[PDB]
């Protein structure tokens, strides 16, 4: 509902990211947070999705080992973790509560990518 | 209560205990079933009320089928191409016993032949629901929730 995200994240060509996503005033456990990568101009690249219940994750083959979506279930702050950062990899992503694949099952359910992350404007500028 | 809020169900009649008190009462699980039908089959989805699909495919017990909530899914399971998507079983063999799970889709005893029982060959208990948005709702797409 606010899904508080990080900002102009300063990573490097050969660093790993811990993007923030404060799972906002919703019952965190009963949902799943998807993500898309808004590569500048490239609409949004399908990032993946964390099941806020169990952590079932449909990553992106693009970022197979790169994106490794994790979360601080305690302080409810989503951490969609991508290694392989670089200037060409410096592109903003967002959170999204995945109601397409309704959580708890990793299975397609009614609804869209639900309420969204603030925005992680990853500045890996070189 | 997220029950009560919904728009017209056209089947809210609690097949079981009163359409109230489910929020309040505490049962272990209500085993929510999920399947598609078309209206002539949906008519049979009720305690007692054995009929064509609760006479071959989808039967319900004496009572307490949770609070089965049917509704037509015109716009949702058939296009005016007359969708032929979801497979059901008429002439499966006979009526299945109240409230089973029937991934078992045993083929039909159609006679005139000993080999596999099926009369000519392959008597499908696989009936692509084969309906149309221009039929009756007895034959409109029907997505239905069971408990």
């Amino acid at each position: 509902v606010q899904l508080v995200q990080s900002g102009a994240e300063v990573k490097k060509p050969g660093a790993s990211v811990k993007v923030s996503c404060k799972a906002s005033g919703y019952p965190f456990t009963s949902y799943g947070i998807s993500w898309v990568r808004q590569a500048p101009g490239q609409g949004l690249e399908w990032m993946g999705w964390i099941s806020t219940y169990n952590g079932n994750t449909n990553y992106a083959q693009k970022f197979q080992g790169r994106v490794t979506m994790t979360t601080d279930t305690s302080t409810t702050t989503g951490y969609m973790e991508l290694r392989r950062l670089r200037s060409d990899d410096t592109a903003v992503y967002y959170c999204a509560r995945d109601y397409t694949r309704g959580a708890w099952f990793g299975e397609s359910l009614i609804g869209g990518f639900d309420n969204w992350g603030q925005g992680t404007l990853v500045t890996v500028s070189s | 209560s997220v029950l009560y809020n919904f728009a017209p169900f056209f089947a809210f009649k609690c097949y079981g205990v009163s359409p109230t008190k489910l929020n309040d009462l505490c049962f272990t699980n209500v085993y929510a079933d999920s399947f598609v039908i078309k209206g002539n089959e949906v008519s049979q989805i009720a305690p007692g009320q054995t009929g064509n699909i609760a006479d071959y495919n989808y039967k319900l017990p004496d009572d307490f089928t949770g609070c089965v909530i049917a509704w037509n899914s015109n716009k949702l399971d058939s296009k005016h191409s007359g969708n032929y998507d979801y497979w059901y079983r008429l002439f499966r063999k006979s009526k299945l016993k109240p409230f089973e799970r029937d991934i078992s889709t045993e083929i039909y005893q159609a006679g005139n032949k000993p080999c596999k029982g099926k009369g000519p060959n392959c008597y499908f208990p696989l009936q692509s629901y084969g309906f149309r948005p221009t039929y009756g709702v007895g034959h409109q797409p029907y997505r239905v929730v069971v408990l």
């Binding site: 898309v36 101009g41 490239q42 609409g43 949004l44 399908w46 967002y94 999204a96 397409t100 869209g112 990518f113 309420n115 969204w116 992350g117 603030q118 925005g119 | 716009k75 949702l76 296009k79």
Partner: protein, 106 residues
Amino acid sequence: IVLTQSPGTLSLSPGERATLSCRASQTVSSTSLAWYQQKPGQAPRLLIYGASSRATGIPDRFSGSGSGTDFTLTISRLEPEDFAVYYCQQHDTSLTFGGGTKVEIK
């Protein structure tokens, strides 16, 4: 299965019926396919669930239609309200978003 917001730079001034192709690939029933508006640099709104359909938040001015693989968001008389960034979704088949067709100005 893919989606294609064709008029990436649809330039029609406010007050004029336009047409915005987001142009799918399959014959997908809009029962899944939808539209999601984002402020030009913000998170997507629930724009058009049903991919032609108007919900609460959407004014009349927003228009659109489409089926098959040629979804044409035939937008009606325009506004800066309609000058956000609209991303036609596909709830079918592993959701690929849209990336393109804003409606632009002079």
